[PDB]
């Protein structure tokens, strides 16, 4: 990219990091027209994908499920606004 361009969820971070889901927090972007935020998961270590889930447009709190413990997961949470995607801020975390 170049520096940053589209504003990204600069407070995107993870909580309730149990073996049975992973709970997210970020700030809700009432921009005007945002499509949503798209979470994706992979098993961090490979590009083995799991699923991409979507939320409304107005969420500040979500919880991903469909994990299995033992491996690390790169939980990506891409914001997609008016004709533009923010910088990907994933976090690597184990289960």
């Amino acid at each position: 990219m170049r520096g940053s361009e589209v504003p990204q969820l600069t407070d995107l971070s993870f909580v309730d990091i149990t073996d049975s889901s992973i709970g997210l927090r970020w700030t809700p972007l009432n921009s005007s027209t945002i499509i949503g935020y798209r979470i994706t998961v992979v098993a961090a270590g490979e590009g083995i994908p799991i699923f991409e889930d979507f939320v409304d447009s107005s969420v500040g709190y979500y919880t991903v499920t469909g994990l299995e413990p033992g491996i690390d997961y790169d939980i990506s949470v891409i914001t997609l606004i008016n004709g533009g995607e923010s910088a990907p801020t994933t976090l690597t975390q184990q289960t």
Side-chain angles (χ1 to χ4, degrees), residues 34-71:
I34 201 186
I35 299 98
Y37 326 84
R38 173 272 233 107
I39 288 76
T40 296
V41 241
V42 321
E46 189 159 40
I48 275 190
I50 278 88
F51 68 80
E52 96 220 85
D53 184 321
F54 240 103
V55 256
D56 200 89
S57 52
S58 64
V59 170
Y61 194 81
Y62 166 55
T63 297
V64 207
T65 331
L67 253 156
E68 203 190 298
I71 310 296

PDB file of all heavy atoms in Angstrom, residues 34-71:
ATOM      1  N   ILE A  34     -20.836   2.302   4.067  1.00  0.00           N
ATOM      2  CA  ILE A  34     -19.999   1.125   4.285  1.00  0.00           C
ATOM      3  C   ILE A  34     -20.789  -0.142   3.917  1.00  0.00           C
ATOM      4  O   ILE A  34     -21.987  -0.235   4.195  1.00  0.00           O
ATOM      5  CB  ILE A  34     -19.487   1.103   5.746  1.00  0.00           C
ATOM      6  CG1 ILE A  34     -18.240   0.213   5.862  1.00  0.00           C
ATOM      7  CG2 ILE A  34     -20.569   0.625   6.716  1.00  0.00           C
ATOM      8  CD1 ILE A  34     -17.735  -0.004   7.285  1.00  0.00           C
ATOM      9  N   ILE A  35     -20.119  -1.141   3.350  1.00  0.00           N
ATOM     10  CA  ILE A  35     -20.793  -2.383   3.002  1.00  0.00           C
ATOM     11  C   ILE A  35     -20.814  -3.224   4.266  1.00  0.00           C
ATOM     12  O   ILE A  35     -21.868  -3.715   4.663  1.00  0.00           O
ATOM     13  CB  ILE A  35     -20.063  -3.089   1.845  1.00  0.00           C
ATOM     14  CG1 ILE A  35     -20.050  -2.212   0.578  1.00  0.00           C
ATOM     15  CG2 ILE A  35     -20.707  -4.447   1.518  1.00  0.00           C
ATOM     16  CD1 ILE A  35     -18.731  -1.456   0.413  1.00  0.00           C
ATOM     17  N   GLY A  36     -19.667  -3.369   4.924  1.00  0.00           N
ATOM     18  CA  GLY A  36     -19.596  -4.130   6.152  1.00  0.00           C
ATOM     19  C   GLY A  36     -18.162  -4.300   6.602  1.00  0.00           C
ATOM     20  O   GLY A  36     -17.264  -3.544   6.218  1.00  0.00           O
ATOM     21  N   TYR A  37     -17.963  -5.324   7.419  1.00  0.00           N
ATOM     22  CA  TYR A  37     -16.658  -5.852   7.761  1.00  0.00           C
ATOM     23  C   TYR A  37     -16.790  -7.337   7.459  1.00  0.00           C
ATOM     24  O   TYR A  37     -17.850  -7.927   7.695  1.00  0.00           O
ATOM     25  CB  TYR A  37     -16.291  -5.567   9.246  1.00  0.00           C
ATOM     26  CG  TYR A  37     -16.832  -4.241   9.766  1.00  0.00           C
ATOM     27  CD1 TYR A  37     -18.154  -4.150  10.256  1.00  0.00           C
ATOM     28  CD2 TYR A  37     -16.053  -3.078   9.655  1.00  0.00           C
ATOM     29  CE1 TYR A  37     -18.719  -2.895  10.543  1.00  0.00           C
ATOM     30  CE2 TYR A  37     -16.598  -1.822   9.965  1.00  0.00           C
ATOM     31  CZ  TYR A  37     -17.949  -1.721  10.357  1.00  0.00           C
ATOM     32  OH  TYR A  37     -18.508  -0.489  10.520  1.00  0.00           O
ATOM     33  N   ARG A  38     -15.741  -7.921   6.898  1.00  0.00           N
ATOM     34  CA  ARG A  38     -15.686  -9.308   6.484  1.00  0.00           C
ATOM     35  C   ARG A  38     -14.597  -9.954   7.309  1.00  0.00           C
ATOM     36  O   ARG A  38     -13.423  -9.595   7.151  1.00  0.00           O
ATOM     37  CB  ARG A  38     -15.468  -9.372   4.965  1.00  0.00           C
ATOM     38  CG  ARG A  38     -15.221 -10.784   4.415  1.00  0.00           C
ATOM     39  CD  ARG A  38     -13.732 -11.168   4.448  1.00  0.00           C
ATOM     40  NE  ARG A  38     -13.248 -11.618   3.124  1.00  0.00           N
ATOM     41  CZ  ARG A  38     -12.445 -10.937   2.296  1.00  0.00           C
ATOM     42  NH1 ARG A  38     -11.982  -9.740   2.642  1.00  0.00           N
ATOM     43  NH2 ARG A  38     -12.107 -11.445   1.117  1.00  0.00           N
ATOM     44  N   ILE A  39     -14.954 -10.865   8.202  1.00  0.00           N
ATOM     45  CA  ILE A  39     -13.972 -11.644   8.931  1.00  0.00           C
ATOM     46  C   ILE A  39     -13.627 -12.813   8.013  1.00  0.00           C
ATOM     47  O   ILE A  39     -14.485 -13.288   7.280  1.00  0.00           O
ATOM     48  CB  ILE A  39     -14.502 -12.033  10.333  1.00  0.00           C
ATOM     49  CG1 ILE A  39     -14.542 -10.790  11.251  1.00  0.00           C
ATOM     50  CG2 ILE A  39     -13.580 -13.037  11.054  1.00  0.00           C
ATOM     51  CD1 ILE A  39     -15.676  -9.786  11.015  1.00  0.00           C
ATOM     52  N   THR A  40     -12.365 -13.237   8.026  1.00  0.00           N
ATOM     53  CA  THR A  40     -11.914 -14.481   7.422  1.00  0.00           C
ATOM     54  C   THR A  40     -11.067 -15.148   8.501  1.00  0.00           C
ATOM     55  O   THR A  40     -10.430 -14.475   9.310  1.00  0.00           O
ATOM     56  CB  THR A  40     -11.080 -14.232   6.147  1.00  0.00           C
ATOM     57  OG1 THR A  40     -11.865 -13.614   5.151  1.00  0.00           O
ATOM     58  CG2 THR A  40     -10.563 -15.520   5.497  1.00  0.00           C
ATOM     59  N   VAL A  41     -10.992 -16.471   8.471  1.00  0.00           N
ATOM     60  CA  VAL A  41     -10.005 -17.241   9.208  1.00  0.00           C
ATOM     61  C   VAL A  41      -9.238 -18.181   8.302  1.00  0.00           C
ATOM     62  O   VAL A  41      -9.782 -18.714   7.329  1.00  0.00           O
ATOM     63  CB  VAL A  41     -10.571 -17.899  10.492  1.00  0.00           C
ATOM     64  CG1 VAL A  41      -9.828 -17.371  11.708  1.00  0.00           C
ATOM     65  CG2 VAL A  41     -12.026 -17.479  10.815  1.00  0.00           C
ATOM     66  N   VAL A  42      -7.968 -18.358   8.647  1.00  0.00           N
ATOM     67  CA  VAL A  42      -7.102 -19.407   8.116  1.00  0.00           C
ATOM     68  C   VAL A  42      -6.404 -20.055   9.316  1.00  0.00           C
ATOM     69  O   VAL A  42      -6.352 -19.439  10.386  1.00  0.00           O
ATOM     70  CB  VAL A  42      -6.119 -18.852   7.054  1.00  0.00           C
ATOM     71  CG1 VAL A  42      -6.736 -17.806   6.114  1.00  0.00           C
ATOM     72  CG2 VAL A  42      -4.912 -18.208   7.723  1.00  0.00           C
ATOM     73  N   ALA A  43      -5.809 -21.234   9.129  1.00  0.00           N
ATOM     74  CA  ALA A  43      -4.933 -21.851  10.119  1.00  0.00           C
ATOM     75  C   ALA A  43      -3.523 -21.304   9.888  1.00  0.00           C
ATOM     76  O   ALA A  43      -2.841 -21.722   8.948  1.00  0.00           O
ATOM     77  CB  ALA A  43      -4.996 -23.379   9.988  1.00  0.00           C
ATOM     78  N   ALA A  44      -3.123 -20.323  10.697  1.00  0.00           N
ATOM     79  CA  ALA A  44      -1.847 -19.643  10.592  1.00  0.00           C
ATOM     80  C   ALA A  44      -0.718 -20.659  10.716  1.00  0.00           C
ATOM     81  O   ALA A  44      -0.581 -21.355  11.725  1.00  0.00           O
ATOM     82  CB  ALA A  44      -1.708 -18.559  11.661  1.00  0.00           C
ATOM     83  N   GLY A  45       0.109 -20.709   9.682  1.00  0.00           N
ATOM     84  CA  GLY A  45       1.105 -21.740   9.465  1.00  0.00           C
ATOM     85  C   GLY A  45       1.014 -22.201   8.023  1.00  0.00           C
ATOM     86  O   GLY A  45       2.043 -22.465   7.402  1.00  0.00           O
ATOM     87  N   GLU A  46      -0.194 -22.195   7.460  1.00  0.00           N
ATOM     88  CA  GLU A  46      -0.466 -22.502   6.071  1.00  0.00           C
ATOM     89  C   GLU A  46      -1.517 -21.508   5.554  1.00  0.00           C
ATOM     90  O   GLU A  46      -2.043 -20.687   6.308  1.00  0.00           O
ATOM     91  CB  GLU A  46      -0.921 -23.967   6.027  1.00  0.00           C
ATOM     92  CG  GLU A  46      -1.050 -24.536   4.613  1.00  0.00           C
ATOM     93  CD  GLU A  46      -0.984 -26.061   4.598  1.00  0.00           C
ATOM     94  OE1 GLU A  46      -1.554 -26.717   5.498  1.00  0.00           O
ATOM     95  OE2 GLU A  46      -0.314 -26.588   3.678  1.00  0.00           O
ATOM     96  N   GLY A  47      -1.852 -21.563   4.268  1.00  0.00           N
ATOM     97  CA  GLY A  47      -2.966 -20.832   3.683  1.00  0.00           C
ATOM     98  C   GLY A  47      -4.274 -21.613   3.709  1.00  0.00           C
ATOM     99  O   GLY A  47      -5.213 -21.186   3.039  1.00  0.00           O
ATOM    100  N   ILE A  48      -4.336 -22.759   4.397  1.00  0.00           N
ATOM    101  CA  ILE A  48      -5.556 -23.504   4.690  1.00  0.00           C
ATOM    102  C   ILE A  48      -6.661 -22.547   5.183  1.00  0.00           C
ATOM    103  O   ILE A  48      -6.551 -22.039   6.304  1.00  0.00           O
ATOM    104  CB  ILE A  48      -5.251 -24.731   5.593  1.00  0.00           C
ATOM    105  CG1 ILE A  48      -4.825 -25.883   4.651  1.00  0.00           C
ATOM    106  CG2 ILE A  48      -6.416 -25.146   6.507  1.00  0.00           C
ATOM    107  CD1 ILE A  48      -4.703 -27.272   5.282  1.00  0.00           C
ATOM    108  N   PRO A  49      -7.674 -22.236   4.354  1.00  0.00           N
ATOM    109  CA  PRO A  49      -8.758 -21.345   4.731  1.00  0.00           C
ATOM    110  C   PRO A  49      -9.777 -22.105   5.584  1.00  0.00           C
ATOM    111  O   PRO A  49      -9.778 -23.338   5.595  1.00  0.00           O
ATOM    112  CB  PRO A  49      -9.365 -20.923   3.399  1.00  0.00           C
ATOM    113  CG  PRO A  49      -9.239 -22.178   2.538  1.00  0.00           C
ATOM    114  CD  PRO A  49      -7.943 -22.812   3.038  1.00  0.00           C
ATOM    115  N   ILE A  50     -10.673 -21.391   6.266  1.00  0.00           N
ATOM    116  CA  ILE A  50     -11.753 -21.975   7.047  1.00  0.00           C
ATOM    117  C   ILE A  50     -13.060 -21.390   6.490  1.00  0.00           C
ATOM    118  O   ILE A  50     -13.681 -22.015   5.620  1.00  0.00           O
ATOM    119  CB  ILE A  50     -11.465 -21.848   8.571  1.00  0.00           C
ATOM    120  CG1 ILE A  50     -10.526 -22.992   9.033  1.00  0.00           C
ATOM    121  CG2 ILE A  50     -12.719 -21.905   9.460  1.00  0.00           C
ATOM    122  CD1 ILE A  50      -9.039 -22.668   8.903  1.00  0.00           C
ATOM    123  N   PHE A  51     -13.474 -20.190   6.902  1.00  0.00           N
ATOM    124  CA  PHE A  51     -14.619 -19.493   6.330  1.00  0.00           C
ATOM    125  C   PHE A  51     -14.392 -17.987   6.396  1.00  0.00           C
ATOM    126  O   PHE A  51     -13.577 -17.515   7.199  1.00  0.00           O
ATOM    127  CB  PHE A  51     -15.932 -19.915   7.035  1.00  0.00           C
ATOM    128  CG  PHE A  51     -16.111 -19.485   8.488  1.00  0.00           C
ATOM    129  CD1 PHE A  51     -16.527 -18.177   8.793  1.00  0.00           C
ATOM    130  CD2 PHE A  51     -15.922 -20.398   9.545  1.00  0.00           C
ATOM    131  CE1 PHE A  51     -16.686 -17.774  10.130  1.00  0.00           C
ATOM    132  CE2 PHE A  51     -16.112 -19.995  10.883  1.00  0.00           C
ATOM    133  CZ  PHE A  51     -16.505 -18.675  11.175  1.00  0.00           C
ATOM    134  N   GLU A  52     -15.178 -17.236   5.618  1.00  0.00           N
ATOM    135  CA  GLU A  52     -15.333 -15.796   5.771  1.00  0.00           C
ATOM    136  C   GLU A  52     -16.792 -15.529   6.129  1.00  0.00           C
ATOM    137  O   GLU A  52     -17.703 -16.044   5.467  1.00  0.00           O
ATOM    138  CB  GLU A  52     -14.805 -15.007   4.559  1.00  0.00           C
ATOM    139  CG  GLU A  52     -15.802 -14.587   3.468  1.00  0.00           C
ATOM    140  CD  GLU A  52     -15.190 -14.759   2.095  1.00  0.00           C
ATOM    141  OE1 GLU A  52     -15.261 -15.904   1.578  1.00  0.00           O
ATOM    142  OE2 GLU A  52     -14.640 -13.776   1.550  1.00  0.00           O
ATOM    143  N   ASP A  53     -17.001 -14.855   7.251  1.00  0.00           N
ATOM    144  CA  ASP A  53     -18.297 -14.424   7.767  1.00  0.00           C
ATOM    145  C   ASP A  53     -18.412 -12.911   7.564  1.00  0.00           C
ATOM    146  O   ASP A  53     -17.392 -12.222   7.426  1.00  0.00           O
ATOM    147  CB  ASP A  53     -18.420 -14.957   9.196  1.00  0.00           C
ATOM    148  CG  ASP A  53     -19.711 -14.738   9.983  1.00  0.00           C
ATOM    149  OD1 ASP A  53     -20.332 -13.661   9.908  1.00  0.00           O
ATOM    150  OD2 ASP A  53     -20.021 -15.601  10.833  1.00  0.00           O
ATOM    151  N   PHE A  54     -19.631 -12.388   7.511  1.00  0.00           N
ATOM    152  CA  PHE A  54     -19.897 -10.979   7.285  1.00  0.00           C
ATOM    153  C   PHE A  54     -20.801 -10.458   8.386  1.00  0.00           C
ATOM    154  O   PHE A  54     -21.672 -11.174   8.890  1.00  0.00           O
ATOM    155  CB  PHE A  54     -20.596 -10.815   5.925  1.00  0.00           C
ATOM    156  CG  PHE A  54     -19.837  -9.960   4.940  1.00  0.00           C
ATOM    157  CD1 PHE A  54     -19.116 -10.562   3.894  1.00  0.00           C
ATOM    158  CD2 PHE A  54     -19.892  -8.558   5.047  1.00  0.00           C
ATOM    159  CE1 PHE A  54     -18.504  -9.768   2.915  1.00  0.00           C
ATOM    160  CE2 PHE A  54     -19.250  -7.761   4.087  1.00  0.00           C
ATOM    161  CZ  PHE A  54     -18.582  -8.370   3.009  1.00  0.00           C
ATOM    162  N   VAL A  55     -20.712  -9.159   8.653  1.00  0.00           N
ATOM    163  CA  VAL A  55     -21.560  -8.510   9.630  1.00  0.00           C
ATOM    164  C   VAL A  55     -22.288  -7.344   8.953  1.00  0.00           C
ATOM    165  O   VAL A  55     -22.178  -7.138   7.740  1.00  0.00           O
ATOM    166  CB  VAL A  55     -20.715  -8.149  10.881  1.00  0.00           C
ATOM    167  CG1 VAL A  55     -21.028  -9.140  12.011  1.00  0.00           C
ATOM    168  CG2 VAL A  55     -19.193  -8.044  10.690  1.00  0.00           C
ATOM    169  N   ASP A  56     -23.061  -6.601   9.745  1.00  0.00           N
ATOM    170  CA  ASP A  56     -24.161  -5.784   9.245  1.00  0.00           C
ATOM    171  C   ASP A  56     -23.653  -4.587   8.443  1.00  0.00           C
ATOM    172  O   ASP A  56     -23.925  -4.476   7.252  1.00  0.00           O
ATOM    173  CB  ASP A  56     -25.022  -5.348  10.439  1.00  0.00           C
ATOM    174  CG  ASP A  56     -26.414  -4.916   9.998  1.00  0.00           C
ATOM    175  OD1 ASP A  56     -27.303  -5.798   9.933  1.00  0.00           O
ATOM    176  OD2 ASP A  56     -26.632  -3.708   9.783  1.00  0.00           O
ATOM    177  N   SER A  57     -22.892  -3.726   9.121  1.00  0.00           N
ATOM    178  CA  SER A  57     -22.354  -2.415   8.749  1.00  0.00           C
ATOM    179  C   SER A  57     -22.111  -1.576  10.005  1.00  0.00           C
ATOM    180  O   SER A  57     -21.208  -0.738  10.009  1.00  0.00           O
ATOM    181  CB  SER A  57     -23.222  -1.658   7.727  1.00  0.00           C
ATOM    182  OG  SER A  57     -24.570  -1.590   8.151  1.00  0.00           O
ATOM    183  N   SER A  58     -22.799  -1.914  11.099  1.00  0.00           N
ATOM    184  CA  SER A  58     -22.995  -1.102  12.297  1.00  0.00           C
ATOM    185  C   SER A  58     -22.516  -1.827  13.566  1.00  0.00           C
ATOM    186  O   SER A  58     -22.725  -1.367  14.689  1.00  0.00           O
ATOM    187  CB  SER A  58     -24.494  -0.806  12.352  1.00  0.00           C
ATOM    188  OG  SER A  58     -25.173  -2.041  12.523  1.00  0.00           O
ATOM    189  N   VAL A  59     -21.867  -2.980  13.400  1.00  0.00           N
ATOM    190  CA  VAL A  59     -21.363  -3.809  14.490  1.00  0.00           C
ATOM    191  C   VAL A  59     -20.114  -3.161  15.093  1.00  0.00           C
ATOM    192  O   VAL A  59     -19.246  -2.723  14.328  1.00  0.00           O
ATOM    193  CB  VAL A  59     -21.038  -5.201  13.908  1.00  0.00           C
ATOM    194  CG1 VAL A  59     -20.270  -6.104  14.880  1.00  0.00           C
ATOM    195  CG2 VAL A  59     -22.337  -5.906  13.505  1.00  0.00           C
ATOM    196  N   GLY A  60     -19.975  -3.184  16.425  1.00  0.00           N
ATOM    197  CA  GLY A  60     -18.695  -3.026  17.117  1.00  0.00           C
ATOM    198  C   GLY A  60     -18.239  -4.261  17.911  1.00  0.00           C
ATOM    199  O   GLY A  60     -17.105  -4.305  18.394  1.00  0.00           O
ATOM    200  N   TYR A  61     -19.065  -5.304  18.007  1.00  0.00           N
ATOM    201  CA  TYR A  61     -18.776  -6.533  18.758  1.00  0.00           C
ATOM    202  C   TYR A  61     -19.266  -7.763  17.970  1.00  0.00           C
ATOM    203  O   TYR A  61     -20.474  -7.860  17.715  1.00  0.00           O
ATOM    204  CB  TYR A  61     -19.425  -6.494  20.152  1.00  0.00           C
ATOM    205  CG  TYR A  61     -18.877  -7.582  21.060  1.00  0.00           C
ATOM    206  CD1 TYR A  61     -17.653  -7.368  21.712  1.00  0.00           C
ATOM    207  CD2 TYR A  61     -19.520  -8.827  21.184  1.00  0.00           C
ATOM    208  CE1 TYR A  61     -17.036  -8.403  22.436  1.00  0.00           C
ATOM    209  CE2 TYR A  61     -18.909  -9.874  21.898  1.00  0.00           C
ATOM    210  CZ  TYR A  61     -17.651  -9.671  22.508  1.00  0.00           C
ATOM    211  OH  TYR A  61     -17.024 -10.681  23.171  1.00  0.00           O
ATOM    212  N   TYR A  62     -18.386  -8.713  17.626  1.00  0.00           N
ATOM    213  CA  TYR A  62     -18.766  -9.980  16.948  1.00  0.00           C
ATOM    214  C   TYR A  62     -18.039 -11.121  17.666  1.00  0.00           C
ATOM    215  O   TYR A  62     -17.188 -10.883  18.520  1.00  0.00           O
ATOM    216  CB  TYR A  62     -18.520  -9.914  15.412  1.00  0.00           C
ATOM    217  CG  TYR A  62     -18.547 -11.228  14.610  1.00  0.00           C
ATOM    218  CD1 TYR A  62     -19.664 -12.089  14.667  1.00  0.00           C
ATOM    219  CD2 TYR A  62     -17.475 -11.610  13.772  1.00  0.00           C
ATOM    220  CE1 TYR A  62     -19.645 -13.347  14.035  1.00  0.00           C
ATOM    221  CE2 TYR A  62     -17.438 -12.869  13.155  1.00  0.00           C
ATOM    222  CZ  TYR A  62     -18.505 -13.769  13.317  1.00  0.00           C
ATOM    223  OH  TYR A  62     -18.401 -15.019  12.791  1.00  0.00           O
ATOM    224  N   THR A  63     -18.410 -12.371  17.411  1.00  0.00           N
ATOM    225  CA  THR A  63     -17.778 -13.560  17.975  1.00  0.00           C
ATOM    226  C   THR A  63     -17.743 -14.643  16.895  1.00  0.00           C
ATOM    227  O   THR A  63     -18.779 -15.064  16.373  1.00  0.00           O
ATOM    228  CB  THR A  63     -18.513 -13.973  19.263  1.00  0.00           C
ATOM    229  OG1 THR A  63     -18.373 -12.938  20.222  1.00  0.00           O
ATOM    230  CG2 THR A  63     -17.945 -15.237  19.911  1.00  0.00           C
ATOM    231  N   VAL A  64     -16.535 -15.066  16.529  1.00  0.00           N
ATOM    232  CA  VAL A  64     -16.313 -16.099  15.535  1.00  0.00           C
ATOM    233  C   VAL A  64     -16.427 -17.417  16.284  1.00  0.00           C
ATOM    234  O   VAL A  64     -15.994 -17.528  17.433  1.00  0.00           O
ATOM    235  CB  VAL A  64     -14.926 -15.979  14.864  1.00  0.00           C
ATOM    236  CG1 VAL A  64     -14.951 -16.582  13.456  1.00  0.00           C
ATOM    237  CG2 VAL A  64     -14.394 -14.548  14.743  1.00  0.00           C
ATOM    238  N   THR A  65     -16.991 -18.415  15.626  1.00  0.00           N
ATOM    239  CA  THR A  65     -17.115 -19.770  16.130  1.00  0.00           C
ATOM    240  C   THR A  65     -16.489 -20.675  15.056  1.00  0.00           C
ATOM    241  O   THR A  65     -15.883 -20.177  14.101  1.00  0.00           O
ATOM    242  CB  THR A  65     -18.606 -20.076  16.410  1.00  0.00           C
ATOM    243  OG1 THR A  65     -19.349 -18.913  16.748  1.00  0.00           O
ATOM    244  CG2 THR A  65     -18.804 -21.085  17.546  1.00  0.00           C
ATOM    245  N   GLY A  66     -16.608 -21.995  15.173  1.00  0.00           N
ATOM    246  CA  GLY A  66     -16.099 -22.901  14.154  1.00  0.00           C
ATOM    247  C   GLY A  66     -14.582 -23.008  14.186  1.00  0.00           C
ATOM    248  O   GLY A  66     -13.970 -23.256  13.145  1.00  0.00           O
ATOM    249  N   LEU A  67     -13.965 -22.767  15.344  1.00  0.00           N
ATOM    250  CA  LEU A  67     -12.578 -23.111  15.602  1.00  0.00           C
ATOM    251  C   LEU A  67     -12.460 -24.572  16.060  1.00  0.00           C
ATOM    252  O   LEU A  67     -13.446 -25.189  16.463  1.00  0.00           O
ATOM    253  CB  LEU A  67     -12.031 -22.130  16.656  1.00  0.00           C
ATOM    254  CG  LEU A  67     -11.069 -21.114  16.023  1.00  0.00           C
ATOM    255  CD1 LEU A  67     -10.977 -19.836  16.854  1.00  0.00           C
ATOM    256  CD2 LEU A  67      -9.697 -21.757  15.852  1.00  0.00           C
ATOM    257  N   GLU A  68     -11.248 -25.111  16.042  1.00  0.00           N
ATOM    258  CA  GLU A  68     -10.805 -26.287  16.784  1.00  0.00           C
ATOM    259  C   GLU A  68      -9.451 -25.961  17.418  1.00  0.00           C
ATOM    260  O   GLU A  68      -8.602 -25.399  16.720  1.00  0.00           O
ATOM    261  CB  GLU A  68     -10.712 -27.518  15.871  1.00  0.00           C
ATOM    262  CG  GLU A  68     -10.815 -28.836  16.657  1.00  0.00           C
ATOM    263  CD  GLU A  68     -10.496 -30.093  15.839  1.00  0.00           C
ATOM    264  OE1 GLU A  68     -11.198 -30.388  14.849  1.00  0.00           O
ATOM    265  OE2 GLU A  68      -9.605 -30.875  16.260  1.00  0.00           O
ATOM    266  N   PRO A  69      -9.217 -26.295  18.698  1.00  0.00           N
ATOM    267  CA  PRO A  69      -7.954 -26.002  19.362  1.00  0.00           C
ATOM    268  C   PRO A  69      -6.787 -26.798  18.775  1.00  0.00           C
ATOM    269  O   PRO A  69      -6.958 -27.798  18.076  1.00  0.00           O
ATOM    270  CB  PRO A  69      -8.180 -26.310  20.847  1.00  0.00           C
ATOM    271  CG  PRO A  69      -9.323 -27.317  20.837  1.00  0.00           C
ATOM    272  CD  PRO A  69     -10.160 -26.883  19.636  1.00  0.00           C
ATOM    273  N   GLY A  70      -5.577 -26.367  19.118  1.00  0.00           N
ATOM    274  CA  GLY A  70      -4.310 -27.022  18.850  1.00  0.00           C
ATOM    275  C   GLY A  70      -3.457 -26.223  17.875  1.00  0.00           C
ATOM    276  O   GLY A  70      -2.232 -26.300  17.965  1.00  0.00           O
ATOM    277  N   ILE A  71      -4.069 -25.448  16.979  1.00  0.00           N
ATOM    278  CA  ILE A  71      -3.387 -24.708  15.917  1.00  0.00           C
ATOM    279  C   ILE A  71      -3.595 -23.213  16.186  1.00  0.00           C
ATOM    280  O   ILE A  71      -4.396 -22.822  17.039  1.00  0.00           O
ATOM    281  CB  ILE A  71      -3.868 -25.205  14.528  1.00  0.00           C
ATOM    282  CG1 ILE A  71      -3.816 -26.741  14.370  1.00  0.00           C
ATOM    283  CG2 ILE A  71      -3.099 -24.587  13.344  1.00  0.00           C
ATOM    284  CD1 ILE A  71      -2.414 -27.362  14.425  1.00  0.00           C
TER     285      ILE A  71
END
